[PDB]
Design an enzyme around this catalytic site. Structure first.
Site, PDB file in Angstrom:
ATOM      1  N   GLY A  49       0.761  -1.242   0.000  1.00 27.19           N
ATOM      2  CA  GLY A  49       0.000   0.000   0.000  1.00 27.19           C
ATOM      3  C   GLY A  49       0.795   1.299   0.000  1.00 27.19           C
ATOM      4  N   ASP A  75      -0.711   8.102  13.798  1.00 26.68           N
ATOM      5  CA  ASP A  75      -1.496   7.275  12.895  1.00 26.68           C
ATOM      6  C   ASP A  75      -1.797   5.915  13.526  1.00 26.68           C
ATOM      7  OD1 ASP A  75      -1.346   6.350   9.317  1.00 26.68           O
ATOM      8  OD2 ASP A  75      -3.039   6.598  10.664  1.00 26.68           O
ATOM      9  N   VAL A  79       5.528   1.094   0.110  1.00 26.70           N
ATOM     10  CA  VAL A  79       6.133  -0.045   0.836  1.00 26.70           C
ATOM     11  C   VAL A  79       6.050  -1.307   0.011  1.00 26.70           C
ATOM     12  CG1 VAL A  79       6.209  -1.373   2.995  1.00 26.70           C
ATOM     13  CG2 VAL A  79       5.458   1.057   3.001  1.00 26.70           C
ATOM     14  N   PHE A 124       3.098   9.618   0.961  1.00 28.18           N
ATOM     15  CA  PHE A 124       4.295  10.083   0.259  1.00 28.18           C
ATOM     16  C   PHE A 124       5.260   8.995  -0.145  1.00 28.18           C
ATOM     17  CE2 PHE A 124       5.203  10.427   4.809  1.00 28.18           C
ATOM     18  CZ  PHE A 124       6.395   9.699   4.889  1.00 28.18           C
TER      19      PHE A 124
HETATM   20 MG   LIG Z   1       0.192   6.514   7.928  1.00 32.15          MG
END
Ligand SMILES: [Mg+2]
Ligand SMILES: [Mg+2]
Ligand SMILES: [Mg+2]
Ligand SMILES: [Mg+2]
Lengths: 350, 346
Positions: free
Chosen positions: B29, B168, B36, B33
């Protein structure tokens, strides 16, 4: 007492039912705020489908803006961009699973699949497969540049005429549309702005916005400069003329032209090297040619050199440092670069 | 006279060379910016690898800051997050193609692959596969919530103690690490802030920033409110106490707890419905239970109800409307929800 509740409201396009859409797993890319998938509509129509990323702030509002601008473009500039087929909004219990091939809960946009190819992928495979996909008889860098640029600049001019600035012009956002004779179409109005009040501006604000740094001048990541009033219905036309947000698309179209014209500028690194040198000589194409071009011995600038350097000149026009000096995409269409040679095609003419 | 050339400088981690790394095609995903990928290090070590998106403004600078925060975490909060294996930077000639299994030009970060699962994926498959991946003996909503929340709040407490706010936290950014007993590990410090001057603050500024709207209070998308002083080495301790940026992670952890505890809240739409009703009743869990929970007939809140409503009470503390009322993750970890059973009769 108890609250009564009520029905859900879902947005739909007449003639487009979720049961008729099959989604294929595998993003055709995540962009900044959404995810694009291939799909099949009614068993036999290849389509592209986009929804919002659940993890990005305001992605739903950005997808709604992209939707609004796509309706505007469908009404006002047909054939410039991938054909817009409307929306499909799915609720929670009726929402499906991508792995099952069914649309998930939330808002979706749908377009025709204009082709399996992007201009980025074709140009990197070579000028030959690019020319074939574009139905371009002159299968040379010059030939493909002339044809592609005439189509791109004409489409940008029509977008600008109806107040739309695309904002993300680049080879990856062009398709040579096989089912319309190979003509180039834009995709991806996800960053586009409606810059006139028709009836309201959309995605149009002072200051930096999203910009692909490869295709935006490093110190002009905006449509309206920070110094600018907020756009309103009364000032929009004045801001258009003063700040020339369409000239953002002119610079990106000059980047596309460099890459089409010069094989060695087709990699990210090649265009990046060129633009750094271009900036270093004061955004002056003749200074690049005189001072730097001798360093580019692995590359062949013939397409830009041809016909008195017409292509260099058009690049200079599209890539002036100052917006006030930079060509509009409409003006750029009249450039000598697009001229027929004297007696072109004589040998078979009637 | 021509200006001379000179060397390129590349960042490298001791023990990590280009030949050592094979990349596999397929993004685990792309985020805001970067992208991965899975990879293999030295033939047999499963890793994950992240590079900067070519099409995103400032992406290499954002990745550099994520690297700095990863070194800080690696030094100060081992085990909280996927293990950090450093970086590798490639130049232009000496870079490859992902489809060919080789790293491309630019900076790359590398971590251990802690597991093929995320808590988001597991919880949506069910409590049972979630509990199995967590090695959680009590394979119920209450059992998985207790084990996961003790591990999450303990890791967040340790991050906050060394000045890092994750920013996050959510099920998709947790992995049940099978090689370490199933314990939960955080990933994705891409938006994390270092809020102490060690030697400077990082990714820490007044006003809104990137947030996942499902896991951030809709009117609190900042670490420091829009009116705050810019942080400096001299005011950072005062700003930490005044503005409590760590309470951003407390709210997100409350959202994690609701999804682990209540199966019906595991879809995006389910948690969104709960939160809109929670806001409508003034961020008051007792008002939600009295006024709204009757509307949720398809759901089962037993894990939150259990033991005098201990789970409801912990959620209330993590999810207070005001930061100055909202529990720290360290304080939350002391809650009665986490108490051992008395008198077990073994
Ligand atoms: Mg994140
Ligand atoms: Mg959603
Ligand atoms: Mg809705
Ligand atoms: Mg885009």
């Amino acid at each position: 007492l108890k609250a009564r509740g009520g029905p859900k409201t879902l947005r739909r396009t007449p003639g487009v039912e979720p049961k008729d859409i099959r989604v294929l797993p595998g993003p055709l890319g995540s962009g900044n705020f959404g995810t694009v998938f291939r799909g099949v509509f009614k068993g036999d129509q290849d389509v592209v489908l986009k929804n919002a990323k659940a993890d990005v702030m305001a992605a739903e509002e950005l997808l709604e803006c992209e939707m609004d601008v796509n309706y505007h473009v469908h009404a006002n500039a047909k054939g410039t961009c991938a054909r817009f087929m409307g929306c499909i909004e799915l609720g929670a219990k009726d929402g499906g699973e991508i792995y099952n091939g069914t649309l998930t809960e939330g808002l979706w946009l749908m377009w025709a699949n204009e082709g399996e190819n992007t201009v980025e992928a074709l140009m990197r495979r070579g000028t030959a497969p690019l020319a074939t996909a574009m139905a371009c008889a002159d299968a040379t860098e010059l030939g493909v540049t002339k044809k592609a640029m005439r189509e791109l600049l004409g489409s940008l001019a029509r977008l600008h005429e109806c107040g739309v600035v695309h904002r993300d012009v680049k080879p990856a956002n062009l398709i040579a549309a096989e089912k319309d004779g190979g003509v180039l179409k834009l995709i991806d109005l996800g960053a586009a702005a409606l810059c006139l009040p028709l009836p309201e501006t959309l995605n149009y604000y002072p200051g930096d916005g999203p910009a692909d740094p490869r295709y935006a001048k490093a110190d002009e990541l905006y449509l309206l400069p920070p110094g600018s009033p907020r756009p309103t219905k009364d000032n929009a036309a004045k801001l258009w003329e003063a700040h020339k947000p369409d000239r953002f698309d002119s610079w990106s179209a000059g980047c596309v032209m460099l890459q089409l014209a010069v094989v060695g500028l087709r990699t990210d690194a090649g265009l990046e090297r060129f633009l750094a040198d271009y900036k270093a000589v004061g955004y002056d194409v003749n200074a690049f040619r005189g001072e730097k071009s001798g360093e580019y011995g692995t590359m062949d600038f013939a397409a830009l050199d041809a016909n008195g350097g017409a292509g260099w000149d058009l690049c200079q026009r599209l890539m002036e440092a100052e917006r006030d000096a930079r060509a509009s995409c409409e003006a750029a269409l009249s450039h000598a670069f697009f001229d027929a040679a004297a007696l072109e095609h004589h040998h078979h003419h009637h």
